[PDB]
Design a protein around this ligand. Structure first.
Ligand SMILES: CCCCN(Cc1ccc(C(=O)NO)cc1)C(=O)Nc1ccccc1
Ligand SMILES: [Cl-]
Ligand SMILES: [Cl-]
Ligand SMILES: [K+]
Ligand SMILES: [K+]
Ligand SMILES: [K+]
Ligand SMILES: [K+]
Ligand SMILES: [K+]
Ligand SMILES: [Zn+2]
Length: 756
């Protein structure tokens, strides 16, 4: 309703104070000033620094420190300011892996303050997110002691400060640093207002600080029981897939259930390739994906503070990759496979199992065994130049000329598109988009999927008299035709081709297609369910045509009906992946086929490249559509590695639909579009299929375009609990597809057999 006031813009805190302290006894200490100065050099070299709002650093106050620390500790730390090298060494010796400096106090104060300054701007809707390039780090510091190069616990102090001075209820702290932030774990052990997550290297205590508490078994005590999550890696050399799958199957479900009003990140880059202490092999590009994922929960309220990362290049690279996500730039192509390794899956599963009682979101999994067979190939896509994102928009009023001369009360109304378009202009989304001109799809182009018999039969209709047009329409299941119905289905496909062209030639990064008549029901030789040509399927082959025959295309169908037309066109094709969320009702719901079931996994060389998530018994909404994305849609999509993502966007699955009978809010469609934007380097094309409530479609589709333009994900309702008829529908797809995609394999025991 107001856009000049909208909070956009990333704050960045950096002060020379951060370089003023170092180790006096060891000239080669990993925690040094070059860590932060290098990050700054690169941020400028990349052009990222100038794109950040400059936020001033402030010193932390004694009372702010005392929200987590003791007065005895604070005063001792304060006293270090006026101590001899010797006095400092003697005190430093008293703690695990710590050095001290005359100037260490000053910098540690500014290192805390800097985070609070960002919390201020984010919480008061001034900036959307922020990142401090601060040292000394925080996550290891405890109430009464220094530890692992930390003096004060920056993010712990910030979590409390948020709750106190900004009256924030729930705070999520994500620690992707390669070390376990025990200092944080401790502070919020018994606090259930602060949920703390920590993926770290462990190898059964062999890796520093060698704590028993760093295991997944340690889930927090008292009131805070289940609000402490440890993901310990017990094998080195973890990659992108190992962190993405962890976030998908474990952290995102937990985070969406917990509903925080703020997300704090202990952004350590010691897991990046080339870090001497981490021993991990995560490419920096991965952090672009993780940062994006966290934008969903806490509705954009995201603050990152620098923790570890001891290789000057690797850290600067990691910071840049995270900074790009905050600044709203498109995600990169993943430089490694989207598949996890067995040791990762074992660590993820043992953590899901260790937290199963406390989280209704994790309770989704029934338990038992999912396949461990050699999975399908998990390829990598060629790097695409990260550029200023542009959202394309295509609409032509000529697509309204297709109508029913008999039943004027037919749900596929011409108004559907003009209404969606109106809302796009009212909300000003249209003026923020790049207008792509609609065109007519050629017969050669229609040939890509459809028979010459089916093409000529619909082509001919541009001349038929109305009685011939009533007769012709009864020759099909649910089809109505008119003298313009052919030109309309030609524009619907033509437009979508011009979008995919813009996207692939880098003219735009993503686009939206307000088109009618729909297409996901149309087959090689027959029209069906208001569809003439499979507009999504033809786009996929037009894309494969302008690139290379092998171009991997993902087709996500969120329309309430299963896209029978799509499913069959690519049933044998391994280059195109088709995922469909639909009301099945054991075969009762349209197009009444058993093809829409979880046991149909594609056939031939396309075995595993076809996913169906069938809905039985209930009004499925956001809780069920989201959990399907976390556990199934996103893990499969990621392992497949698409180069183009196509949405068969039907809002007939929305709350208020006459034909759907499902309760998916417009805010829910926003979060589904958001999730999909981390794939294909953000190369997402949104195509209108179903949706029959003029109001519900205009609102829900505008929400998608808002997400494409990089606006913060909206506030959601409650996502736990979900229909027991859905929990069972999900676990069916998991079992059906686990032999093909390693990202699914959450082999957990019989924790289900407990509580009711
Ligand atoms: C035996 C057919 C039952 C399903 N259908 C047709 C249908 C076809 C496609 C879609 C769709 O969502 N297309 O994208 C929805 C319903 C209908 O119920 N359609 C309908 C037609 C006129 C008036 C009221 C309803
Ligand atoms: Cl050991
Ligand atoms: Cl279950
Ligand atoms: K960690
Ligand atoms: K806690
Ligand atoms: K660290
Ligand atoms: K569907
Ligand atoms: K397939
Ligand atoms: Zn539909």
């Amino acid at each position: 309703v107001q856009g000049k006031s909208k909070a956009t813009g990333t704050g960045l805190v950096y002060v020379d104070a951060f370089t003023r302290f170092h180790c006096l006894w060891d000239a080669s200490h990993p925690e040094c000033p070059a860590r932060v100065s290098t990050v700054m050099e690169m941020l400028e070299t990349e052009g990222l620094l100038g794109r950040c709002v400059q936020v001033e650093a402030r010193a932390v106050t004694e009372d702010e420190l005392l929200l987590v620390h003791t007065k005895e500790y604070v005063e001792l730390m304060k006293s270090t300011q006026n101590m001899t090298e010797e006095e400092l060494k003697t005190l430093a010796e008293k703690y695990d892996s710590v050095y001290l400096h005359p100037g260490f106090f000053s910098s540690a104060c500014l290192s805390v303050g800097s985070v609070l300054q960002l919390v201020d701007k984010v919480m008061t809707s001034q900036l959307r997110n922020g990142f401090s390039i601060n040292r000394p780090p925080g996550h290891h510091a405890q109430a009464d002691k220094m530890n692992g190069f930390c003096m004060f616990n920056n993010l712990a102090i910030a979590a409390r400060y948020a709750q106190k001075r900004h009256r924030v209820q729930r705070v999520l702290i994500v620690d992707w640093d390669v070390h376990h932030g025990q200092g944080i774990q401790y502070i919020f052990e018994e606090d259930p207002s602060v949920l703390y997550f920590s993926v770290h290297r462990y190898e059964d205590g062999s890796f520093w600080p060698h704590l028993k508490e760093s295991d997944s078994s340690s889930v927090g005590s008292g009131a805070g029981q289940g609000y402490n999550i440890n993901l310990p890696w017990n094998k080195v050399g973890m990659e992108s897939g190992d962190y993405i799958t962890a976030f998908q199957q474990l952290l995102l479900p937990v985070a969406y259930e917990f509903q925080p009003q703020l997300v704090l990140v202990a952004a350590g880059f010691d897991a990046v390739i080339g870090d001497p202490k981490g021993g991990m092999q995560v490419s920096p590009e991965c952090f672009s994906i993780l940062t994006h994922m966290l934008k969903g929960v806490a509705q954009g309220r995201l603050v990152l503070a620098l923790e570890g990362g001891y290789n000057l290049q690797s850290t600067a690279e990691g910071v840049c990759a995270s900074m790009r996500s905050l600044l709203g730039d498109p995600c990169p192509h993943l430089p490694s496979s989207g598949a996890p390794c067995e040791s990762a899956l074992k660590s993820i599963s043992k953590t899901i199992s260790d937290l199963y009682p406390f989280w209704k979101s994790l309770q989704t999994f029934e338990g038992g065994p999912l396949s461990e067979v050699s999975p399908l190939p998990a390829p990598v896509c060629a790097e695409v130049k990260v550029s200023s994102p542009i959202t394309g928009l295509v609409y032509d009023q000529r697509m309204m000329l297709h109508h029913n001369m008999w039943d004027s009360h037919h749900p596929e109304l011409p108004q559907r598109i003009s209404r969606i378009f109106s809302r796009h202009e009212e909300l000003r989304l249209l003026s923020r988009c790049h207008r792509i001109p609609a065109r007519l799809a050629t017969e050669e182009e229609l040939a890509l999927c459809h028979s010459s018999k089916h093409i000529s039969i619909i082509k001919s209709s541009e001349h038929m008299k109305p009685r011939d047009l009533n007769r012709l329409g009864d020759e099909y299941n649910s089809i109505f035709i008119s003298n313009e119905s052919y030109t309309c289905a030609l524009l619907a496909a033509g437009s979508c081709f011009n979008s995919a062209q813009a996207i692939l030639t880098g003219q735009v990064r993503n686009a939206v297609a307000i088109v009618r008549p729909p297409g996901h029901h149309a087959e090689k030789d027959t029209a069906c369910g208001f569809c003439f040509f499979n507009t999504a399927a033809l786009t996929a082959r037009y894309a494969q045509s302008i690139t290379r025959e092998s171009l991997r295309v993902l087709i996500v169908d969120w329309d309430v009906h299963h896209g029978n037309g799509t499913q069959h066109i690519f049933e044998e094709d391994d280059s195109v992946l088709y995922i469909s969320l639909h009301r099945y009702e054991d075969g009762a719901f349209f197009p009444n086929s058993e093809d829409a079931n979880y046991d149909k996994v594609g056939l031939g060389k396309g075995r595993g490249y076809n996913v169906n998530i069938p809905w039985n018994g209930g009004k499925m909404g956001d809780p069920e559509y989201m959990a399907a994305f976390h556990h199934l849609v996103m893990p499969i999509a990621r392992e497949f590695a698409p180069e183009l993502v196509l949405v068969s966007a039907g809002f007939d699955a929305a709350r208020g639909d006459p034909l759907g009978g499902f309760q998916v809010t417009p805010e829910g469609y926003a979060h589904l579009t958001h999730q999909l934007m981390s794939l294909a380097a953000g190369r997402v094309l949104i195509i209108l299929e179903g949706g029959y409530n003029l109001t519900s479609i205009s609102e829900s589709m505008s929400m998608c375009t808002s997400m494409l333009l990089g606006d913060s994900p909206p506030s959601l309702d409650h996502l736990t609990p979900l229909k027991t008829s859905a929990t069972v529908s999900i676990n069916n797809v998991l079992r059906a597809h686990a032999p093909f995609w390693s990202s699914l394999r959450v082999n957990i025991p019989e924790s289900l057999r407990l509580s009711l």
